[PDB]
Every structure is written in structure tokens, then in C-alpha cells.
Amino acid sequence: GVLITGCGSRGDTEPLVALAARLRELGADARMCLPPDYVERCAEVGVPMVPVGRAVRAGAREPGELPPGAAEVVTEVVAEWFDKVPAAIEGCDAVVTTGLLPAAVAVRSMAEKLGIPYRYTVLSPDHLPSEQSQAERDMYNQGADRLFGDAVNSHRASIGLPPVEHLYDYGYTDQPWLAADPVLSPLRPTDLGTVQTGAWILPDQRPLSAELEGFLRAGSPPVYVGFGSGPAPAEAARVAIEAVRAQGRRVVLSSGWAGLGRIDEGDDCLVVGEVNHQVLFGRVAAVVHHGGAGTTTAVTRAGAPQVVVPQKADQPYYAGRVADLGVGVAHDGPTPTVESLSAALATALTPGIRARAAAVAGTIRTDGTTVAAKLLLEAISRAKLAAALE
Ligand SMILES: O=c1ccn([C@@H]2O[C@H](COP(=O)(O)OP(=O)(O)O)[C@@H](O)[C@H]2O)c(=O)[nH]1
């Protein structure tokens, strides 16, 4: 089998689920360890998953309950991953991981004990160890060793392993994969070591809800607005609904983890939970979003013009890429006004940008999980998987 693990928000998780589902399609018994947020997501695509640790979404936790990334709970997190992974990693021939470092180091430790290959994956080029300075890598290593090195080493001893240090190097490896689209996120030409697979995208077969189908059929193509797993700007729903209205468009408002909702009873608005983005984004006039490596990839592949309203990370990088590609607008700052979002939308709603977005869509590959599957085949070899890829 193959074990796939991670701890993070939806963007850290969805690519992993994509890889797991692809591996199962290719005849490999891929299974996962993920935070409990993702139970429904894995089940609906037929991927076995073992929940590990605290929920990542605040609203999924108890009041006052700290997130898995909180420094205060790191000892517990390390213990939990060492407790729950052994049953899942049994019978596995390789492990692929992204996300939270203390969890990743626990997972690599268990891979090391079993003598099976471990691969870490990053989702945007700026996160590659080789894109950090030496001083930065030193700093990350020292921080990790100091914060949770003792806990990791205690659990390593419990399974007979020697101590390890430089936990950033250890968790990320010396050459993590880059599961990111090369058009959207180009890798510098001098980097020969990084394997850039393309984004890991699950071909989404889920139907749209009856309510969303009805909404789409009942009028002109709407504008989607959503902020994904992350925070939304002050007055986000009001500003976005009013700005979209100003452009003579209907609104699909994704509640997201921020829990956005309608501002009135207007029938020109539909509030949605989880949706099939691949399908929906082909049926909207534009997408206002946080940029989100995964969301940006989905929008770009769907060919919808964009307004990127970056909040944190990472996200300003994607806003800039979208603007550079000419397929959308990089909103100036994290907090739109009705005026600023209206202006950005007007630009994103031209026939020209529609054509540009349509063209760039065809350049975005969706077979990154097949590249990853082949990489796994070669790592394990050094059966049904070789046969399926042939
Ligand atoms: O209703 C939704 C919300 C999210 N996604 C997918 O979840 C991923 C979110 O990726 P991103 O990197 O933007 O994650 P975030 O920053 O929101 O955690 C993308 O593949 C989205 O298309 C989806 O299919 N439907």
C-alpha cells in the first residue's frame, strides 16, 4: 500500500486526497492520515482515511480548543501522530506527506523505522527549502529542534530509533516535490533537483446541488465570491454582494471557513457550502477569491476571469501571477471597498479577459498525480501499479 498524510487547511489536504484517489484508480491500496475535518471529503471519493489529531477548522473544535498548529499543544500533536500512524502505515511501501512539520517528522520517523521511502511535497515554489536562504533554513531547523525536538526524540526512542536533529531538513527532506502547476507557478531554470509534477487535482464527479443548479439555470452567469479556509476581510459579504450587484451580476457566495452569509433576502444571491469548483467555475462569469494555490489553480484551469483578494501567505504571490498572466486582477490589498472591488470586477468582466482566461485554461495540466504515481513506482522499485501506468 501507500500512506498519504498531512495536517493543514483544505489547500494542504485536497492535493493529498487527489493523489490517494489516483493511486487507487491505478490499483494501489492508498490510504490516508488527516485531521478529522476531512472525513466526509475522503469518504465521498472512496479513499480510506484515519483521522488524527485536532480539527484544523476553528468551528469544528470546541470553544477555546487550540488548533493543531498551536505551539502549546505540540507535544500532544507529536504523541498523537506516533500513536495513530502505526496501524495505518502497516503494509505500506511508501509515504507521501505535506503540511504541519511536527506531524511530518513523526511520519518520516515511522517510515524510517519501517525502511520505506518518505516524500514531502510543497504546494508553492516559495516554500521550497532551496528557495530559502541558508540563514533561514538554519533558523527553521533551530526553531523546530527547540520547540518539539525532545518530544520527537522521546517517541523515536520508544520505537528504537536514534535521535535526530535539524527537523526542518528532516521533515521537508533535501528535495521535496513541488506539486504545483508550472504555468501558474514557474520554477527557476537553475533548479534541477526539484521535481515539479504539476498540481494534484482530483477530477471532480460530484453533482452540483439542486439549489445551485436551479440558481445557475434561472439567470445570467453569476460571480463567485469565496475566501476558502482562511479569514475574510471586514464586511466581506456586504462589500462583495454590493460590488457584484454594481456590475449587474448575480452572486454565488461561498460561506467558507469564515462563515460568510447573505446580507438581505435578495434572490440574486445564493449562499453555498462545499461545491464542485471544477464544474461551477466553468459556469460563472468571474471568481473573486483569496488565492489559495489550489483555488487559483482551479479557477485558472476552469478559464474563469479572476479577482484575487489576497489575505496572507503565499496569496499575494498568486494575485501577482494572475495579473501577470492577464487572466484577472490583483486587488490592491486584502480589504476591498465596494468601489475597489467594483472596479476590479469591471476589468475582470470584459470580453478580452474572458478570452485570455479561456486560453490560459488550456495550458494548465491536470495529470500531476500520474507523475507522482510514476515517481512512487520508481521509489518503491528501487505489479498492478507498473501495469496501470504502462
Ligand atoms: O467549495 C469548495 C472549496 C474548496 N474546494 C477545493 O479545495 C481546494 C482549496 O485550495 P486552496 O489552496 O485555495 O486552500 P485554502 O487556502 O482555502 O485552504 C481547491 O482545490 C478548491 O478547488 C472545492 O473543491 N470546493
Side-chain angles (χ1 to χ4, degrees), residues 254-308:
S254 176
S255 191
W257 290 17
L260 303 185
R262 65 174 42 259
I263 63 171
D264 54 43
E265 293 306 308
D267 70 0
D268 62 337
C269 178
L270 186 75
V271 182
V272 301
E274 172 72 10
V275 301
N276 184 330
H277 275 171
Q278 289 160 209
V279 170
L280 177 60
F281 291 162
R283 297 168 67 182
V284 300
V287 181
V288 180
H289 73 270
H290 63 301
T295 301
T296 307
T297 300
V299 178
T300 307
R301 173 63 191 171
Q306 328 194 22
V307 178
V308 189

Side-chain angles (χ1 to χ4, degrees), residues 87-286:
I89 202 173
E90 194 175 41
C92 292
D93 305 298
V95 187
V96 178
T97 297
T98 198
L100 184 65
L101 185 59
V105 163
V107 171
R108 184 177 180 177
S109 294
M110 284 167 283
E112 182 188 329
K113 165 78 172 184
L114 283 177
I116 60 172
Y118 165 88
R119 298 290 181 271
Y120 191 83
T121 307
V122 305
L123 303 172
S124 301
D126 286 349
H127 298 336
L128 289 167
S130 54
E131 295 293 332
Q132 319 300 306
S133 70
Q134 185 63 55
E136 284 169 332
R137 293 191 297 273
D138 289 348
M139 187 182 72
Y140 305 144
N141 278 305
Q142 293 281 255
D145 290 355
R146 289 164 170 162
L147 183 59
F148 52 88
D150 286 347
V152 167
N153 282 335
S154 289
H155 286 96
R156 286 176 62 89
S158 291
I159 63 173
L161 291 167
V164 69
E165 64 179 356
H166 314 129
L167 284 180
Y168 170 83
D169 292 348
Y170 187 72
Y172 276 63
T173 81
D174 62 359
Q175 205 78 263
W177 293 337
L178 177 60
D181 183 74
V183 170
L184 188 58
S185 307
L187 181 71
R188 68 176 63 254
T190 54
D191 184 347
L192 300 182
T194 299
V195 182
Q196 180 163 203
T197 59
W200 296 351
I201 294 165
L202 200 160
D204 197 349
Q205 300 268 252
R206 296 173 300 168
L208 300 185
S209 72
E211 293 72 33
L212 182 53
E213 194 61 48
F215 190 73
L216 294 172
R217 292 165 183 273
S220 58
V223 172
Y224 176 105
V225 179
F227 292 86
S229 305
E235 318 279 322
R238 187 194 54 79
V239 169
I241 290 163
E242 291 183 1
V244 172
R245 283 175 174 162
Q247 293 302 313
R249 292 281 173 177
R250 304 186 301 145
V251 192
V252 174
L253 177 67
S254 176
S255 191
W257 290 17
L260 303 185
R262 65 174 42 259
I263 63 171
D264 54 43
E265 293 306 308
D267 70 0
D268 62 337
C269 178
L270 186 75
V271 182
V272 301
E274 172 72 10
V275 301
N276 184 330
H277 275 171
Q278 289 160 209
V279 170
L280 177 60
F281 291 162
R283 297 168 67 182
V284 300

